[PDB]
């Protein structure tokens, strides 16, 4: 029930896998880099996150090129190929 | 010191286990040209190994990784029968036969 940028995760979900799974631009390496930047230990889980940490994760994700922005980039590239 | 420099500069051409330095030359058309080439390279290597005036390859450890790989690509029979396991008491004992005794004496 942990909510980050309108995306829900179960408490037991591992952060470095969950962020990669439920966000468009983040993969394994990007999720690991974000977690290392935020100081979370490698196998930290969502239910352990404090609200300030959730907001920090949200800010870090927002500074990334992800979700709608990356989808629009890919769609624009495909359209340019079509053009 | 000169020998250590020789071995260091040999690089993959030197084998520390067998202590052999081997060079192969086939670039030239004839074998005599390759023999001259190998001899000249040996003289160059020896001359500059014997040279220690401005040469400081004592602190460079000898590298054997190539030899390690070459030996690793071969089977080893290093083991031997344990020494203490041997029991000479049970060895066959030759048995007297008078026939050869009289034939020879």
């Amino acid at each position: 029930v942990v909510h980050i940028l309108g995306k829900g995760f179960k408490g037991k979900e591992v952060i470095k896998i969950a962020l990669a799974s439920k966000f468009y631009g983040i993969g394994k390496t990007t999720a690991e880099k974000i977690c290392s930047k935020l100081g979370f230990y490698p196998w930290m889980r969502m239910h352990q996150l404090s609200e300030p940490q959730i907001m920090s994760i949200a800010s870090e994700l927002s500074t990334m090129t992800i979700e709608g922005d990356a989808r629009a980039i890919v769609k624009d590239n495909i359209a340019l190929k079509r053009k | 010191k000169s020998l250590h420099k020789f071995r260091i500069l040999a690089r993959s051409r030197y084998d520390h286990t067998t202590d052999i330095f081997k060079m192969s030359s086939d670039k030239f058309e004839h074998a005599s040209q390759n023999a001259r080439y190998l001899h000249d390279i040996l003289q160059r290597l020896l001359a500059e190994s014997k040279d220690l005036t401005e040469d400081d390859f004592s602190d460079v450890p000898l590298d054997t990784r190539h030899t390690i790989a070459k030996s690793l690509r071969k089977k080893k029979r290093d083991y031997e029968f344990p020494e203490h396991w041997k029991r000479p008491e049970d060895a066959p004992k030759k048995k007297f036969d008078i026939v050869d005794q009289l034939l020879s004496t």
Binding site: - | L9, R11, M23, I41, D59, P61
Partner: protein, 55 residues
Amino acid sequence: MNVPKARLLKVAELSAKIFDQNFNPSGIRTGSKILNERLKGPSVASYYGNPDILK
């Protein structure tokens, strides 16, 4: 590793000098393979037999 890189580089340069080997620490693509590549011309041309035969 513990041994410094400068010593190994000097060893490599000098050894390459002795054995008439070219030393390229930069890693730049000089293309020496082409110069050292063996020629396959005569064997390829000899595929069908020597052309001088009694007819």
